[PDB]
């Protein structure tokens, strides 16, 4: 049985985009029954179910299209590494889309499940919001192929779109690293340490996903049953290559960011050491001088030096000389 | 055959013989009453709680035909999760964990399972377990467990136990979120304590999960008296869970490894801010007190003491020097 | 053939020839009296203590037909645990450890075992070993060691030795617990030292256990004049133990790696506490002593000095500026 | 970006030219055109030719050439995408190779990377650079002045020659970096300033970027060393081994540096901490002799009446004596510290 | 120069000698020429011989010998390039081996490495050193006094004998290093000095260089232990195992040292940090008793009027009393902080 583990409740819509070599149709219903017929449609269809907290709908569709119910349980469990299972009817794919909110610097991950079946691609999102608008455009307009190709290319097209998003995400992150690696060693901030730890954390979650993502495309690139080897596989290679390019970049960032707090310590240590130097040069000229001026404010009666008309200047002289010898001796430090 | 554990006080035996049509249950402390079920034609769940009673483990081990090295393992609770297959029975060792809030430390009881014929033998240390879900489903004939044989019973138990780990990870994630906030506020020994505690717990946790993943890898691939027919896809579900779990723990370990480095960075800054204050104070008032110390030397012939635009003029120069200082603190604060 | 060790004073030889009914034992210092047992049709346990007597190692090595490179290894005690198989004898090198609390250090004696035909040769450095359990089972005819051949004898010895490591790890876990308190609550003079010592010991320990795991991996997989019929499942029990042990040591190393980082974090706190005190003191009394320094200036025309409601008004202003400060220090403390 | 098409991802606009160096044992000719058509014929030249296309932002030119020589268009898309790990793909006719050339800015201690793509086809080596600037002048000289044996050898040796040249460059880069490490690992023990920390972090970062390329570079030469189809095994493979060995030597060096540099900030912490501890020692010995002495001198400047000691007149000296003794006991007590 | 040619990359540019030791079970022929031509004949000797060429900066000599014995010229280029990881290449006529000998100066805490190249051919072991100085005297003194069984055995055992000698040297090196660690791990505990940190970093660095060599050394002996073409499997391979085992034993020991030394700076921080915290404690207890006491004594040196307490005949004592009490309260409050 079938519980949704996610946290996304409010949304529910269904997009259909049935398209053919000439002329492409598209609606948004909230009525699951209206979409089911496309199961049997002779040109490719992209049924996009947003809001799988509506588990009833996932059940109805899973049954009608003939998806083993363990798969439907996976689809609904969003805490899960990217993966690919092949079957007799259908390929089942689980992916993540990320979203990096600058400002408060945290990244959410929605989970997108794709099933390729017959001439359909089923898509299961958690909440409205996705990366796929490029693919909608290409269908609505035409811009190269996609119109001309079957549902396996549709799947290619979607998975490409999603992986291209990761590049945009990494750009945002590289940008944050550059900011951060400045804050640490020139212009620091209240929240620098926090952010540095945040960034580490995000990179972890990111890395944990990309390595598996590289597997799923490794699978879609070698053995490939109802994907037309004749055409589609070289495209799925293009995307596989991208995920390698991506996985490298993340290793780079993790590597780099691991040093930042160590830089930040070294900075603060400097900065503290400079504070202490100042305190010390001040303390170490004026404490003995105030001690001397403290002696000659003693109210003792056998105080011969107090008589001198030349004694007041001579202390000012010795107080000054002691101070000048000190400042010289601080041709080590400051 | 010695019991290495520390749990003495409990001893009971629960039987739950079930079929598609009826289920029996009882609790004896009389081992002889349970033995017959060895040959029962519908699945039985014999649950022996209190293995400090080694006599009972011996009697049962003999009757069911369990090689005595296995009975020695069953009794030794300091031990990594394991699976050994045999001709007649599968032997499995697992752990159940318990997160003590307060102490923030986690204890572990050891559960040994043997699947034999149409029986699942269960060997606990002490009363307390994670399996009540499975009891409910049998009692109230839920899901499909009544319809299925003893290998599904085993699936059902091992699933229940592995689901428990998710609950444990939730408690831990919750602590990490708390902690990773506490780390960058006021400096307190308690924070450091907890941080070290959390590291330690994640170690013990990791040391168990990796092996647990192996046992389910084994139950997913070779599979002799598990009906490949049906049961293996379920044991996959659980195997997948244990991967999901091991990934989470690697994530937490990774994350928590940084926390004391954050904490250092934070306290060090916080201290540096304290020193800044000491220094700005020390560095305006020490030279001012020095000036006021000069005038107040009890010297004879001190011309400035007499002049009466003099007391004001020092107050003036003392103030100006102080304002020059605060300006020069156009770097720090 | 030189003995690289440091242990000179001891030499004796124990023999324990046993059969399904009658066991003999003696202690000679006369090597010739033991040699005959080479041909004994029931298993014999010849235990040569004091291999600094290299003459004795030579004589025995020759008589039993042990390639002389092996005899050179036996005598070289600075060496990782090893197993070499030969056509007719297995050669095994192991370590026994000894942890002294107080002065927190561990020594390691090296034990070499050769299994040949119906003999187990044992080569110790000095009197002292872990094997007394095995002697008592042979003397009082316990378990089933009397019933079994010389390959089980070997099992029995290697098991005994590996079980010792568990006892060692308990002592070490106990030191960790002590230490991880000294770091968090209530430190001591030598904590940093000991922390480094413990790391070092865990290195030496780890350096042996990983190889020990290999030797038992070898004795578990291919295994030629070990009766596969019986003995191999026991050698598995020991192999499993050595994994359990290697995990535990990885656990300790993991844990102990954190200690100095905890200790820094605690010192950092502790320092930050100190600086806070220095600063609140410095920052109330420096400006107050400055004011009291002004009115001890010996200037003429100091109107306030003879404004009599002046001494009180300063005491008032000195107190007020102090109370404002203490308020401002419900941030820090 | 619909997947088929041909866009240049780099940042180098600005330059475009084409060098040809057709050589044989007896003559070589060379020219620089900006007219792609003039180069194409050399496809069928019976002696080896080195067509070097600088400025692949001109994607039109990459397309024209790719078509004429028969390069699957996915490869042409890779050639144009410069954010990419070194790699080797073999094909029926042509070997395709992607490499990086590095450039260490002193100043900004940072290192940029141009991407060089090489295709070996029949008796040609196609070279695709981003911008004018390369490491290959050694190979040009050897052709121009007929040195070593490159004139005698075919286009697969040309490829060897180029890849050797490029790999030798990395050694020069590592020298610059070793030199920086040696400097830095000294500077870490001197005064605390931020510039040190900066550089230390810069160096770590550079070694990361460096490591990211070398490990793949080692693979490409591993491939060129083992299976080798239109490389004459007779002759060329032992040379490609020489270069493979170099890249191992190189990768070891970088692992070495990363290993070493990982410690530097830890050294620097230990330095500054010491240095601070020495500052504090001075503050403390000063504060701890003069605070109690100023306190004594503060007592005897109290304006109290009935202050007997102020009178009885071996008194001023006796305080100076006790103030001095207290000070000398302090300095003695400070042969625990400094 | 082109890559093909023969340059010596090392820094040892003064020594040149050649030793020959052509031995049989009864006659052994040793001389030292600087004349390369006199040694070349021995290639054909039916009993084993050990030609030892010291000073490969004389590249002419390496060339002449390499040609006469038939050593592919890429190998001769490797022999001359001393910046290079230990390795083994097998050929149809000869095994080629590259090794390092190390030398640890205490005082100056640094280690030099000379590179030794060995070629085993027919019945002759060629040895190529950089400079006079080596570890092989044991092997000479077994051939000269006909000890062990080296006289009885062929040139493959000669090679065994040399490689064993060299590997045994590493044990002596590790003892010197263990000795430094012991010194250092004492010097960390007690002291804040500048040279300690330096040395600690130095030792890390040395253990890196050492580790970078031993892991490859383990490989070369792994190769000489397994496939072994005309190394007489009958006899020699069990000896080459003995040495292979040694190199594992050695590699462990350095992993041990690296492990151990990785902690030292962390110990050193923790010490200094404590040490500083103890300094600050003293400053603070002094500051925090005497600052408020000097403040009180500062009040009663105010030149005000009226100041009633100045007259009161118990004023001066009562402050001395209150100043003492406030001090004693402080010292008690400092049983928290030692
Ligand atoms: Mg006065
Ligand atoms: Mg489940
Ligand atoms: Mg650290
Ligand atoms: Mg414990
Ligand atoms: Mg694209
Ligand atoms: Mg070259």
UniProtKB/Swiss-Prot annotation, chain A:
GO molecular function, one term: magnesium ion binding
UniProt-annotated site: Threonine that confers selectivity for Co(2+) transport, residues: 280
Matching InterPro entries: CorA_cytoplasmic_dom, CorA_TM1_TM2, Mg/Co-transport_prot_CorA, MgTranspt_CorA/ZnTranspt_ZntB
Main location: membrane
Keywords assigned by UniProt, alphabetized: Cell inner membrane, Cell membrane, Cobalt, Coiled coil, Ion transport, Magnesium, Membrane, Metal-binding, Transmembrane, Transmembrane helix, Transport
Result for mutant: residue 298 to A: Abolishes pentamerization. Abolishes ion transport
Effect ascribed to mutating residue 300 to A: Abolishes pentamerization. Abolishes ion transport
Lipid biosynthesis as UniProt keyword: no
Record note on what altering residue 300 to W does: No effect on pentamerization. Increases ion transport
Signal peptide limits: none
Residues spanning the membrane: 278-298, 310-330
Outcome, altering residue 299 to D/E/T: Abolishes pentamerization. Abolishes ion transport
Subcellular location(s) per record: Cell inner membrane
Result of altering residue 295 to A: Increases ion transport
Effect noted on mutating residue 288 to A/G/I: Increases ion transport by suppression of a kink in the transmembrane ion permeation pathway
Outcome following mutation: residue 279 to A/V: Increases ion transport by suppression of an obstruction in the transmembrane ion permeation pathway
Protein family (similarity comment): Belongs to the CorA metal ion transporter (MIT) (TC 1.A.35) family.
Entry function: Mediates influx of magnesium ions. Mediates Co(2+) uptake. Has high selectivity for Co(2+). Alternates between open and closed states. Activated by low cytoplasmic Mg(2+) levels. Inactive when cytoplasmic Mg(2+) levels are high.
NCBIfam families: corA (TIGR00383)
Protein name: Cobalt/magnesium transport protein CorA
Native source species: Thermotoga maritima (strain ATCC 43589 / DSM 3109 / JCM 10099 / NBRC 100826 / MSB8)
Lineage of the organism: Bacteria, Thermotogati, Thermotogota, Thermotogae, Thermotogales
Gene name as annotated: corA
Swiss-Prot record, chains D, E:
Coiled coil stretches, renumbered: 167-214
Molecular-function GO term, any one: cobalt ion binding
Key words of the record: Cell inner membrane, Cell membrane, Cobalt, Coiled coil, Ion transport, Magnesium, Membrane, Metal-binding, Transmembrane, Transmembrane helix, Transport
Pfam families on file: CorA
Sequence ranges on the Extracellular membrane side: 303-313
Membrane topology category: Multi-pass membrane protein
UniProt-reported outcome of changing residue 303 to Q: No effect on pentamerization. Abolishes ion transport
Result for mutant: residue 299 to A: Increases ion transport
GO annotation, biological process: cobalt ion transport; magnesium ion transmembrane transport; protein homooligomerization
Catalysed reaction, written as an equation: Mg(2+)(in) = Mg(2+)(out); Co(2+)(in) = Co(2+)(out)
Family recorded in the similarity comment: Belongs to the CorA metal ion transporter (MIT) (TC 1.A.35) family.
Its biological purpose: Mediates influx of magnesium ions. Mediates Co(2+) uptake. Has high selectivity for Co(2+). Alternates between open and closed states. Activated by low cytoplasmic Mg(2+) levels. Inactive when cytoplasmic Mg(2+) levels are high.
Annotated protein name in UniProt: Cobalt/magnesium transport protein CorA
Organism: Thermotoga maritima (strain ATCC 43589 / DSM 3109 / JCM 10099 / NBRC 100826 / MSB8)
């Amino acid at each position: 049985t079938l519980v949704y583990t996610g946290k996304y409740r409010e949304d529910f819509e269904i997009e259909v985009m049935n398209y053919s070599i000439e002329e492409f149709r598209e609606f948004k219903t909230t009525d699951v029954e209206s979409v089911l017929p496309f199961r049997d449609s002779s040109t490719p269809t992209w049924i996009n179910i947003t809001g799988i907290h509506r588990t009833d709908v996932v059940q109805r569709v899973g049954e009608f299209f003939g998806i083993h119910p363990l798969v439907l349980e996976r689809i609904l469990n969003v805490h899960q590494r990217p993966k690919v299972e092949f079957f007799e009817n259908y390929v089942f794919i689980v992916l993540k889309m990320f979203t990096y909110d600058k400002n408060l610097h945290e990244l959410e991950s929605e989970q997108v499940s794709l099933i390729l079946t017959k001439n359909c691609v089923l898509m299961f999102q958690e909440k409205i919001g996705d990366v796929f608008d490029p693919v909608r455009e290409r269908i609505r307009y035409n811009r190269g192929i996609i119109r001309k190709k079957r549902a396996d290319y549709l799947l290619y097209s979607l998975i490409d779109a999603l992986v291209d998003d990761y590049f945009v995400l990494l750009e945002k992150i590289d940008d944050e690293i550059d900011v951060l690696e400045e804050e640490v060693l020139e212009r620091p901030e209240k929240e620098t340490v926090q952010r540095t730890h945040q960034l580490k954390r995000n990179l972890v979650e990111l890395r944990k996903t990309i390595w598996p993502l590289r597997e799923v495309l490794s699978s879609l690139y070698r053995d490939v049953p109802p994907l037309i080897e004749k055409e589609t596989v070289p495209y799925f290679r293009r995307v596989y290559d991208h995920t390698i390019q991506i996985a490298d970049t993340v290793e780079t960032f993790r590597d780099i960011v691991s040093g930042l707090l160590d830089v930040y310590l070294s900075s603060v240590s400097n900065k503290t050491n400079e504070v202490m130097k100042v305190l010390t040069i001040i303390a170490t000229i004026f404490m003995p001088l105030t001690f001397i001026a403290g002696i000659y404010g003693m109210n003792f009666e056998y105080m011969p030096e107090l008589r001198w008309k030349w004694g007041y200047p001579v202390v000012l002289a010795v107080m000054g000389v002691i101070a000048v010898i000190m400042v010289v001796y601080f041709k080590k430090k400051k």
